[PDB]
């Protein structure tokens, strides 16, 4: 579904009255012609696309995880964090870590490993910005071989669109928790 003329790229213009910035490339997946505040002019589009894909992946994981945590919690986590939902669970795990319960180091482990991956992948971002072969977001992680050949077009556009939707959705989820105190399911 690259559909360079229907769903992304070429004359696609989100805002009919104002044309997009010259810097924004049509070849990039997910180009609806949207950059009113001209961020692409200020910053490298490679950096911005890396940031967009990273944010979308993190937010997609966060939304799916909020739903999963609200509907199911592993055997035993209730013992260590009582009943906690969303960011409450994060705070509860950190609290128990401070309290001295060795079982509550989940967030520390998550940080260690995610930061390890980020630290070892940072050179990938620098190489991309230095005109390297790597595209902004591709980490060459396609074990199952799901996105291969024809699917790549739709897979990439679907990734970006689902990631943007998840970026919005996780924000909605977190703020609904901050107000109601409920989960993504309780509210609905």
């Amino acid at each position: 579904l690259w559909e360079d003329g229907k769903v992304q790229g070429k004359g696609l213009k989100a805002i009919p009255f104002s044309d997009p910035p010259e810097s924004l490339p049509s070849d990039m997946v997910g180009y609806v012609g949207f950059d009113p505040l001209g961020f692409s002019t200020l910053f490298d589009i490679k950096f911005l696309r890396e940031a967009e894909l990273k944010h979308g992946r993190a937010a997609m994981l966060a939304a799916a995880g909020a739903i999963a945590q609200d509907i199911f919690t592993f055997p035993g986590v209730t013992s260590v964090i009582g009943d906690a939902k969303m960011t409450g669970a994060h705070d509860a795990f950190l609290k128990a870590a401070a309290d001295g319960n060795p079982k509550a180091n989940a967030m520390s482990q998550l940080f260690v490993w995610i930061g390890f991956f980020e630290l070892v992948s940072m050179p990938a971002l620098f190489e991309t910005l230095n005109g390297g072969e790597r595209a902004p977001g591709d980490f060459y992680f396609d074990p199952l071989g799901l996105g291969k050949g024809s699917g790549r077009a739709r897979m990439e556009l679907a990734e970006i669109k689902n990631g943007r939707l998840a970026m919005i959705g996780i924000g909605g989820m977190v703020h609904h928790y901050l107000l109601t105190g409920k989960g993504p399911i309780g509210t609905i």
Partner: protein, 176 residues
């Protein structure tokens, strides 16, 4: 031959009126000695600094960020109150911004004050661009004057600008 600003004096040789914001005003002849492009860039930077400074001298008197609600409406007192860490972060932000200016001045040639910051694409129309260039220079000059006055008024009265106006203690009692 004759200066626009001072009709009874000869036009400064370097100031031919082509550059933005030029009315032939150079009674002491800075342009003859110092590099005119450097002077123009310095003027533009000072004007931008003072435009932001004049806006921020009065904005806290109307609204404050919830984190800094306790800080005084007096800008100088708020500066004293902020603390080293926040000032250090502001300094790092300003230095990161000024790295680009360093590159453009010492290792590049460009229109004075051109750092490539035009995200909203308001400078593409040449006529609007000329008006905006002169407007930036003149608003910067006015902000320089106004912010100097504001700093001295805050020194004297130990109050914000709007507070001083409302209390009408316009007149000094001596040195602080």
């Amino acid at each position: 031959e004759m200066s626009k600003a001072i009709p009874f004096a000869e036009r400064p040789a370097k100031l031919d009126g082509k550059i933005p914001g030029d009315v032939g005003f150079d009674p002491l002849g800075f342009s003859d000695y110092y590099d005119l492009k450097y002077l123009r860039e310095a003027e533009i930077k000072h004007g931008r600094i003072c435009m932001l400074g004049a806006l921020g001298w009065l904005f806290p008197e109307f609204a404050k960020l919830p984190q800094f609600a306790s800080l005084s409406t007096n800008p100088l007192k708020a500066a004293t109150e902020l603390g080293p860490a926040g000032w250090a972060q502001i300094f790092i932000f300003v230095g990161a911004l000024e790295s680009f200016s360093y590159e453009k001045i010492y290792y590049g040639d460009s229109a004075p004050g051109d750092l490539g910051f035009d995200p909203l694409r308001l400078g593409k129309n040449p006529v609007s661009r000329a008006h905006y260039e002169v407007a930036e220079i003149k608003n910067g000059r006015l902000a320089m004057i106004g912010l100097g006055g504001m700093i001295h008024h805050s020194l004297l009265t130990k109050q914000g600008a709007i507070e001083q106006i409302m209390s009408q203690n316009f007149y000094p009692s001596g040195f602080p």
